[PDB]
């Protein structure tokens, strides 16, 4: 075909057409073999083909990916058909080989239909009746392995998969397939509401991670109690809301920033906490000398003052307990030195 695409000038003159008709049977047989190879490749099903997983990496949902893949195969087959029609001339189907090729192509195209999968997916969507309407987030009961008690883990009343459905619509709408108006409305609503839901779920996951990190080190919860209280108050305010409203965006933004500030203050308090604890442990085994003890105390008091200027919560009781422990250690060291 490239060879002929080089030369098309006197195809109107029936002198070169004798040559193209001489090899016409070879043309038809080789085109049939190429179509056979293409059909063999198609027979490898979409989930069985690496194209499916590539499209999955390509943000293409599997149903839409299969549909578009079949459509592209049909497009290439039609390109082959019109290209044969152009190169050979009008009415190649009149030849027995030509009509055989055309009926093979028609049968393959019929086997290559695509609207049935669209109908099946739409029917499944209607049957399952996806939705997001309900509470802002859900609190549920789970017996997490490792603890005998029933953990009341906090979740978000929002299935992450729903956006995928929207993407299917967001792909199928331009594909030429018309979806029911209910599906359109549901997909559009889920798409526009997705950022708030994902912000809430990431915020709550970050809060759960940082709070379990805090309770991992019980020495710091007493200080972080104020931030935990304000976060709990914000959560209590939010939970009463129904899933859809107009205060959603400000509440989401303020909860996100509050959680971020909570986490950063938690990590700063944690790092200064192990610093102070390590210095106390060094003081435990520090050699008997007024200068070294005074230096350790000076550094500890400087760290305490640094905590004070950050305006954290519940400082005095933490300071009192730390002073109690350091005086106990001082008494033990004094006993050793005196003896």
């Amino acid at each position: 075909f490239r060879i002929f695409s080089r030369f098309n000038a006197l195809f109107v003159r029936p002198h070169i057409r004798g040559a193209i008709r001489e090899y016409q049977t070879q043309l038809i047989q080789r085109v049939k073999d190429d179509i056979e190879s293409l059909h063999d490749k198609f027979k490898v099903q979409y989930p069985q083909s690496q194209a499916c997983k590539m499209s999955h990496v390509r943000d293409l949902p599997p149903v839409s990916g299969s549909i578009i893949w079949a459509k592209q195969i049909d497009r290439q087959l039609t390109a082959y058909m019109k290209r044969v029609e152009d190169v050979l001339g009008k009415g190649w189907e009149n030849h027995v080989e030509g009509q055989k090729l055309k009926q093979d192509g028609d049968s393959f195209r019929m086997k290559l239909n695509t609207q049935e999968i669209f109908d099946d997916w739409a029917r499944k969507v209607q049957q399952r009746n996806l939705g997001v309407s309900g509470r802002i987030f859900t609190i549920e009961s789970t017996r997490v392995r490792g603890r005998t008690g029933n953990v009341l883990k906090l979740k978000v009343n929002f299935l992450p998969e729903i956006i995928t459905l929207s993407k299917e619509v967001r792909n199928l709408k331009w594909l030429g397939f018309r979806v029911p108006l209910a599906i359109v409305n549901k997909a559009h609503q889920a798409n526009q509401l997705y950022p708030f839901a994902i912000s809430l779920i990431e915020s709550v996951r970050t809060y759960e991670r940082t709070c379990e990190k805090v309770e991992e080190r019980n020495t710091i919860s007493l200080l972080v109690a104020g931030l935990k209280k304000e976060v709990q108050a914000l959560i209590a305010e939010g939970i009463a809301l129904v899933w859809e409203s107009y205060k959603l965006d400000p509440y989401v933004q303020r909860l996100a920033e509050t959680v971020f500030n909570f986490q950063e203050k938690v990590d700063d308090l944690l790092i200064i906490e192990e610093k102070i604890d390590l210095e106390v442990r060094s003081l435990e085994t520090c050699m008997y000398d007024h200068k070294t003890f005074s230096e350790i105390l000076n550094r500890v008091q400087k760290a305490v003052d640094d905590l004070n200027l950050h305006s954290y919560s519940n400082l005095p009781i933490w300071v009192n307990k730390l002073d109690m422990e350091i005086e106990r250690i001082l008494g033990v060291r004094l006993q050793a030195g005196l003896r």
């Binding site: 490239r2 695409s5 293409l38 490749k41 690496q50 194209a51 997983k53 590539m54 990496v57 390509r58 943000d59 293409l60 578009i68 893949w69 459509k71 592209q72 195969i73 497009r75 290439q76 390109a79 967001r170 792909n171 331009w174 997705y194 950022p195 708030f196 994902i198 912000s199 990431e202 965006d249 989401v252 933004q253 996100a256 971020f260």
Partner: protein, 394 residues
Amino acid sequence: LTEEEKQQILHSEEFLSFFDHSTRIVERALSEQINIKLSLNRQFFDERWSKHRVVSCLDWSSQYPELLVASYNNNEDAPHEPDGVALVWNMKYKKTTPEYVFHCQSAVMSATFAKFHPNLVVGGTYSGQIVLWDNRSNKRTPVQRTPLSAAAHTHPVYCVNVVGTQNAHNLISISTDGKICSWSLDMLSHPQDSMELVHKQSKAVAVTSMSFPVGDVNNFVVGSEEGSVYTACRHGSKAGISEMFEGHQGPITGIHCHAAVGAVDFSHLFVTSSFDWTVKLWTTKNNKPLYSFEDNADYVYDVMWSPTHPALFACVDGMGRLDLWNLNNDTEVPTASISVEGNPALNRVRWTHSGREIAVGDSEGQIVIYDVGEQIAVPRNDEWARFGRTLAEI
């Protein structure tokens, strides 16, 4: 005889410079100095960070033309192990081990170097969170992470780039929903600019990848999964979609503007690798595609211009063959072609800076880099002239 001081100095991690220099010097020590057309050059498959893993993006460092960044999505082999895998691979001396590794809690979709600073690496993940990493510091956690907000990116980000020069830089990122956002390398916690790209009747564009005219800032060009190509000005006198293109039937996967600059101005040429083997070349001033690439079917992922040759580029097919395509010598047959052994799903292609060799990603994680024939690597004034007259052909 110490028993704890060595143990505690081993426990205490002051090994930053230690580990950095040891890694940078032992692979040097790999050298065996004991006193007693296409061709594969270096094939890399990290057994530990590329076992049954799909290459997600590729980039070559302009500042250091020996450093490559590659990405990875979540690993289906094990979800418990770190999912977002980023790799930095170096051209200093041969070694199987990667030079640097990086983890992101979300699947990493695209990654690139920073033009503002020659050491920071910036990448968009599947959660739409731009991730910053410092190569000089030896850390696995992301250095910085953009907030996940409605204003910021929330849908998966597949293209991130740095525009402007080293004192007029701007980090431009695209979200698959259609948000364009501009950040700065100094602070990655608030979008300097953010705007949801729209073509008409307030419907957005499912942008997959974007490119820009080389030597110019602003006036961006994007491709859509819908099967369209758009020209959209970043700021101009009016931001948003400025020009529809007739485009390709199937989804648009990889878009790139012409790069090579010589005695003639060809910075207005666009290559788009769609999902139908059809690598379409056109120009921004014409609404219709100029030429078409048709030899097979079924998903050639991406195409990239060779920065040195004006009429030569590369495109890699999903079935497992990369073909170097020249415009000057041919228009219907590839000027060069090669297939990675095992016939794997080769994903991504990237021309290195100054050209002369190519980098290819794979669904198996085995990235292969290899040079090109000298008789076809180097251009000449004849190449530019004949390239221009081949544009004059149609």
